């Protein structure tokens, strides 16, 4: 679920999902068009694609379980949808951590009109 993803993001990065990732660049928190602005935005692009791979799942609300094996996120077995959603979120959280070094506050609340063009998954 979105809330679980947000807790995972905070655990991983020490930033609150809202507002650090909820309106960032062209893809973070609100997904659709444009060239991603930076690596963090690309994490969101890929995460959007990952959810897009699951048209008959409901990632905003469906809850999954996961645990930490010293640091590492391990998705626990739920329904097929839950497992796949968890893997998408895990990847994005790791991606955010891997790209914290280039995270830029200037991309928070990034205006829609600067995001133009479709980029294929």
């Amino acid at each position: 679920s979105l809330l679980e993803f947000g807790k995972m993001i905070l655990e991983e990065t020490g930033k609150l999902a809202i507002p650090s990732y909820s309106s960032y660049g062209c893809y973070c928190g609100w997904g659709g068009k444009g060239t991603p602005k930076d690596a963090t935005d690309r994490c969101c692009f890929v995460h959007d694609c990952c959810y897009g791979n699951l048209p008959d799942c409901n990632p905003k609300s469906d809850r999954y379980k996961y645990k930490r094996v010293n640091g590492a996120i391990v998705c626990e077995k739920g329904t097929s949808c839950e497992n796949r959603i968890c893997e998408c979120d895990k990847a994005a959280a790791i991606c955010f951590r891997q790209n914290l070094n280039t995270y830029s506050k200037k991309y928070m609340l990034y205006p829609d009109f600067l995001c133009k063009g479709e980029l294929k998954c």
């Binding site: 928190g29 609100w30 959007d48």
Partner: peptide, 4 residues
């Protein structure tokens, strides 16, 4: 809350 959030939507990506």
């Amino acid at each position: 809350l959030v939507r990506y």
